[PDB]
């Protein structure tokens, strides 16, 4: 039960990485930003307006 | 045979069943409050006040 009609889309859940392998502060920003990229692309394909 | 048509009311959603053709529609009130019958008193007025 995870579509309102068959044929629309449904959410997404996206995975980053271990917790204890980013020990330094900017080495989390590159995974965050290098996920967020399959983000703005798995939204767009649903029609959500920008 | 029939005519194909549109069916306002019955809820063709993922994964929930449609076998009722009335499931959208809402119910109203009516108009009218059904109140108690009232009741009197015969003694008021045979005796001394």
């Given at each position: 039960s995870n579509e309102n009609i068959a044929g629309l889309g449904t959410a997404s859940v996206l995975e980053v990485g271990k917790?204890?392998?980013?020990?330094?502060?900017?080495?989390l920003g590159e995974a965050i930003i290098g996920q967020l990229t399959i983000a703005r692309a798995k939204l767009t394909s649903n029609y959500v307006p920008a | 045979a029939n005519v194909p048509g549109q069916k306002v009311g019955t809820d063709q959603g993922?994964?929930?069943?449609?076998?009722?053709?009335?499931?959208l529609f809402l119910k109203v009130f009516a108009g009218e409050v059904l109140t108690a019958f009232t009741r009197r008193s015969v003694t008021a007025d045979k005796h001394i006040v």
């Open positions: 917790k204890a392998d980013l020990n330094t502060p900017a080495k | 993922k994964g929930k069943s449609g076998s009722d053709a009335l499931a």
